[model samples]
Structure formats: structure tokens, C-alpha cells
Target: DVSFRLSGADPSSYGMFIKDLRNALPHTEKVYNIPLLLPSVSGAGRYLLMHLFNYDGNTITVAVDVTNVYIMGYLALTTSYFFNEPAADLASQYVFRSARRKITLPYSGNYERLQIAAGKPREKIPIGLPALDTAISTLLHYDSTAAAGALLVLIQTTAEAARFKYIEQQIQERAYRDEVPSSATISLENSWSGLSKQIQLAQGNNGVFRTPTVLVDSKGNRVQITNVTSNVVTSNIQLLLNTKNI
Candidate 1:
């Protein structure tokens, strides 16, 4: 798996940016297309295609596996352009602003399916998340293991959302400082007093604020877990403040 952070002022330019990435692969042999499915959000009708190559005559396929792609930016500004009615409306309400809009892309390695003996019962992999019940229930009987694998993907997506939230908070703090009015009468301590208060307001109460911690597998899939404790954000702020000698 491969992961990279990209920053740009224009959100619409991301398609070309991703295409530039597709063209940079080494030893590329051929390209193929697959329909991208976003079942959880009821979103579909998109295709993700990638390059295939041979290294030392051994075939290797490379693709932009969109299992996890996180975006951070101005909410109302970006969402309206991407989705239709209800989704755009919902996103506008909850989306937080970031100093510079960004997208974090990660790639996954393709794995060969394990073969089982004919007439032998396949293993039933269990998924414990209640949120995934509806999505995987129908497929469990036919392919329980595959269903469980899908659950892991959903969980990893959630983790990436949390990580984005954490980074967004940090950027918001920097943006706030950048926007502060400068005056001859303003003292550093007073400026800090206002900034501190703004940070406190942004952090909010523990249950309402979420901080993401990510665990990346060797193949570049990051499994993020969110911490909702108030201290998580508070502690991070204090750490940043102390580092800067605020």
C-alpha cells in the first residue's frame, strides 16, 4: 500500500492531480478498469482503473484502491460541488474548516484468493460491528470471509475520518492565528489570551470532540481509532503550546 498527503487551494483540480499520480508508476505494463462501489453511503456508478506491469517477467498489477481517502476543507464550499441534495446538506452542517484543503491517499496491495478443497466447508469469519450488519448480512452465507473483510474496510474508513478531524483541529488553530488583527497596542500575552480562548472553544467538551489515532499496516491501509475524551484534544493543545513556549 502507498500513502501520500496532497495540498491545494482548488478542490476541483484533484482529478488531474490523481491522474498525474497514475502516470508516475514505474515499469507500468498495462491498465484495467473496475467499477468503484461505495455501498455504505449508497454511492456508486464510478470506476477506478489502474496500471498493470511485469517486473522481471513477473506480472504485477497496481491500482488506486480507494478503500480509504480522507478530505479536509471548507464544508459548504466543497460539499455542494461533490454531492446532490441530502448528502450535501448533511455534510455542510457537520464539516469543519481547515486552513489548507488536503486529501490523504493510500494504496493497498492486491492479494490472491486462497484456494479451498472441493466439497470442503469454508471458514466463517465473524464481524463484530453492529453498524455493518445490514451491509454484510446477505453475503455472509455465500462468502462469510469476504463479508468480514468488507467490515474491516469500513472500520478503517472510520479511523481515517477521525485522523482527519485531529489534523483539521491543528490547522484551524493555525488559521485562527493567521487571521488575528495586528495592532501596535496588542501585547503577545493578550494575543495569546484570545487565541487560547478560541482553542478552548474549538476543542469543546470531551464527548463532542474526537481525535484520531491511526495504525498503518505494512500494505499502507491505516486502521484509525477515535478517542472522544475531552482531555485528548486538551492535551494535544497543551503539548503544542508548550513546544512553542506559549
Candidate 2:
């Protein structure tokens, strides 16, 4: 029933970073014991936890409100991380997703761009979904208790199914740039699917899986999260990149 995007002339980039965060979250939960702050709307576990259930491995992206999230289309990264990831942020300018919660969502078929732009939707979106699927459509929210290790975040208004265009904007953008789309990504999936399976196994054995150091705030602002330990040998690649240390 809803979708999000950057408030820019480029229409294809709608909800782009959100799509990336959706993919990384499952991994975050497995390691941090929390998936991008706030709590799950429905306690049915993993998929319900973040409203990010389906991952499109074919294209290497994830979805929200079920499937229509990614169908908004794509835009190649014009600005790379070292140059622009932290430099520009459009949190307030983001075009937030609005919704009709009582109405059941359209599942499949011709869902179009106009539907997305107009903030309206109809059944059989070619390009749409959530058919009988429910929990994943539940909107996001803020919670003070969830102030630790959140990878991406959103604050939602339940009635309209409205959520921030994207808070934690810079955080998600950096994540997408370095980890997902880039050739030298930290993503185990894009590098290889079974790579993810093996990495988790590896994480389980060592009890140490590293996530980037973007912080937490209940208002959906991504600040500075915490460090694991001072041990150099166990440091994440992110620490070396940010602090310029040995």
C-alpha cells in the first residue's frame, strides 16, 4: 500500500537505500540481537521482525511492504562513498510513503510507476505485491529501548502507514555503496549466496561478525553505535577506514 524515495529529480532512485538496508538487516539481527531498531510489529520471527522478508537474490536487492518497494526502479550511484556518502543527507526531503491500512494490498500484475508517484495503488500491480502476506506491511516505528546496534531505522505513524522518507539516510547510503553495489563489497550474498551461509557459520564459530559503526537514536537518526572491543586483531574493516589507525 506504500513506498518511499529520495525527493529528487531522479525518479528511479526511489527507496534505493531502503532496499539495501532491508537486505543487510537479517544479518544484523543474527549478530546484534536486534534488527534496525524499534521492535517487530508481528512477533512471527525473522521476516516479520523488520518488515523485510523477501530478498531478490537474482538482482541482489531486498523489499518492504512486501514486493512493491524495489519495483520503483533503479539509479546508478552517481556519487561514490569516499566522496559523497557522508557529505550529503536528505532525511527531511525524502518523499515519505503514505497508506490506506484498512485496505488489503494488491498482490500481482501490472503495477505501474504512476501508482507509485501518485501515492495511490490498485490490484495486480505488475510490478506490485503483498497479496495475502500481512505482517511485512506493518509500518515502522521508534523505540528508546532499541538504542543499540541498529543498522538502519525508521519512525512511523501507524494510521496512514506513513514513515519517514528515510531517516538514517547517510548510514544506509554508505552501507549500500560499500557493501552492496560496489565491486569490493562486504556483502556475502552478492559476493556469493552460499558465501553468506558460510560466513554465518564462520560468525557462529568465532562469535564475532562485524557491522559498520553507524550509531543509534530513537528519532531514527543514525549516529555512532558502539565498539565491540579494543582488541586490534578483531577490529572491523570499518574502524580502520574511519579512524586511520593501524
Candidate 3:
């Protein structure tokens, strides 16, 4: 449960936050506290409203990024209690305002003026299944045949499966075969030996476009396809490990 960002002189020991501190922490009754700093002002007119409510001894925390400021003000005024304590005068306090305008004195109680006309309840627009299809197709085109095969196997739908099968058949027919020994060769063993180094190198590489998907080919050179549909395609090489002679 120990989480830390290490800043030290040594470039080699930079990632020792995970490697060193991770193992040293006590295994039992461990809790990690990580602070998340969110943007105060967003590009979209959305302002994050932090909602805190107590339900049966449990504290419920909800946050809604409201695009419309008027709706936000209205919601706060209506649902939330701004002044639960006794007021000095009979005057109704202006809890909040839209357009970042400062409140003036000599308050007049006009409930209609405070009313917010919300257009519609916003629904999350999901990235379509077609987008998923296109992504998978692109991966198949750019990446290896094994990657494509993995993607095809990963997709659960009948149509996707059929598409994968067709592509696989085409690959098997057209693709050039490289001679790999039945028993593990020295070159193969060396290549396999270098896998750990490759994995270490790959682990260091980071980018926004890349995803946390792993692909590996083992000693037996067996192809085990997993799936497709995500931005990146991947397969597990360990499937070939301890596989029975069939």
C-alpha cells in the first residue's frame, strides 16, 4: 500500500520507488494515501462541484463537472443549504451567481429570476462499436500477423470472428514461412534469453497513444490468439508453456 514518487540523484535507481519501497512495506493492515490535484479551470465551461452527503454513518462524495453555470447555481441554491444557521435579517442571501458577477446589496426576493432553465440531462456519448472495429482493423494492418490473429481471437462477436478467420486464412496462404526448429535452437534460446532485456526496454518506453498491453512469443513458437478491439493488440506467450504434444 506504499505509494511514493522518488526524486534522487541516481538515474539508475530512479524507479526504486516501486522496486524498493513496494516490497519493504508491511503486508497486513496497510493503507496508501495518494493526493490527486484536479484542474480548477477547465477548457470546457465545466466547473467541478464537489458534493458531500452523509448516508447512514457513511460519507458519500460526488463530483459533477457542470458546463452551465446557471444550472450549477440553481442546483446549489435549491438542493444545498447555504445558511442553515439563523439569519441576521429577513433578507434572503444570494448563495451563488452565474457569469462571475458580483452580488449587489438591497436584495429583492425574486425566485423566478433565480430559476435555471436546464436544456437537457447530459448522457455519456460512448465511442461506437464501429470505432472499435476500425481500431482493430488498423492494428491488424500495421502490426504483425500474430498481433492480428490475437485481436481476431479476442473479439467475441460472430461477425468479428468471421472477419478474423478470413484474414488468418489469407495470411496462412500468402505469408512467407521462416524455418524455426522443432526443438529449441541456440539462436532461439538466445533470442528467448534477450526477451527479458526487451521487456525491460519496453517497460521504460511511455507515451499517450500506447496502452498497457503485452505481446510475447515463446520457445515452442506456438501462436495463441487472445483478442482485438482496443487501440493496441496483444497476446500471452505463456500459453505455449507446458503445452501437451497434440
Candidate 4:
């Protein structure tokens, strides 16, 4: 919802973003990298094609130094003038939602591009899931390259939107526990068809599952077991938030 960069003449507010992000991540829930497959331009000749379609879409795109959210069908980017990152104590309980105008975007700088993209028709991105995995893994393994591709899934119905909200509540609830049930059989108030449905979801940080698939413990996995040092040897946990300097 907000970027790390701060605004204003108040020097006191400096470094608030990193503090908030670290607090949000916490200990066990600390993810090495934000596992994001989001819609945003990273480079040329890369990711020109990708956007989830039901026949429909950015609702997180992380830039080189900034993180942002693009709510679907919204015409403007969240204005920097009113942008607010979560507080250290209340991670997602941000102040931007306090006023509708706070989240409303301003008109300036490459604003025309958004208009063009929104007007165009959309369909399924040509690539398959395996290829998409290959794409992400290439960057993950090459480990020092740049490319982009992601999808946008839309929520079309009020009932489905309510279900989506409920799912988020469950994710928040799950994040607090050191241990939890392996799976849950819970009742959802609405299905896409507007009827109650019961389904099971695997336990993990989010709604479904979580795991570390990348090892920026980057020895190319050649070292013996004894060679391992710290947890950083498995995940690149030293990152923009936990690391010194950007």
C-alpha cells in the first residue's frame, strides 16, 4: 500500500518505513523476499504480457527501491502527498484509509500511460504456469538479473468480495501463532454462487501454504552440511529492512 520512501520536512519521521516493515514481518513470519508476482514494468523486453483474466485485473508491484499497490480499476497511483505506510505496531492498520482523498492519486508524470493500459481489452496471458515458474526461477537462480511478469485476478461479486475479506482475516489470525492445525475445515459465508460452502485450506502464513524455494544462501548448493553457518545461509534474510543501508 505504501513505499519505503517518506515525504515532508519532518526529519523526525525519517526511517519510519523500514521500522514498520520489520515489525510487520516479525520473527517466524520473516520472509526472505516478498514472494510477489505483481504487475509493474521492471524492464524492456520483459513481462509485457501478464495479467490474470477471468475474462477480466494490480491490486502489488515492487519497484527497485519502492513498493506499491495498484487497486484494480483505479485510475491513479496512490499520491505520494498522502501516502502512509503501516506503523510499527499496527502493520496494515494504516492511516491512508482515514480519508478517501488520501488514497486518491494525483495527475502527473506518465499518467497518460495508465490511461492507455486501462482502456485496452484483456484476456489470459499467453504463458502457462510452468513457463511462468520458469520465468521467476530464472531470475531467482540467475539471482542477479531483471525481468517482470505477473497476473491480476479480479473479484467480481459482492459475495465473493466478502469471502475474500474473510480469507484475509484468517491470514492475519494465522500469522500470530508459532504452531497451528495442519488444515482447517471452515465454513465460508458465500460461494461464487452466493451460497455457503465449506472447504479445507492448508496451514501456513497465508491462506494456502508457505515454503522457501530459493536459497540465496548462494553457494549454488555445492557446500557440505557442516559448511552451513547461519539461517542466512539458507535464505537471504539480510535484506532491505534488516540490513544496514538500502
Best by lDDT: 1
State TM-scores per candidate.
0.18, 0.22, 0.14, 0.19
For 1-246, candidate 4 gives per-residue lDDT tens digits of: 222221131122212332333233222222323222122323321111111111101111221111111222111124212112221112112322322332322221121332233342112222222222333333222111111121111111111112233322322333223111111101221111111100111112232222222221133242222211223223322212211111
Candidate number that wins on TM-score, 1 or 2? 2
lDDT of 3 by residue, 123-228 (tens): 1111112222232333322223222222222121111111122222222232222121222221222222132223223433531212222322334453322223
How accurate locally is residue 77 in candidate 1, as Cα lDDT from 0 to 100?
20
Query: TM-score of predicted model 2?
Result: 0.22
Candidate number achieving the greatest TM-score relative to the actual structure: 2
Which of the two candidates, 2 or 4, achieves a greater TM-score against the reference?
2
Cα RMSD of predicted structure 2? 19.1
Instruction: Provide the RMSD of all predictions against the true structure, rounded to 1 decimal.
Output: 21.3, 19.1, 24.8, 19.9
The better candidate by lDDT, 1 or 3, is: 1
lDDT for each candidate structure: 0.25, 0.22, 0.22, 0.22
Task: At residue 226, give the lDDT of candidate 4.
Answer: 20
Give the local distance difference test score of model 3.
0.22
Candidate 4 minimal-lDDT segment of 10 residues:
192-201
Worst 10 residues of 1 by lDDT: 27-36
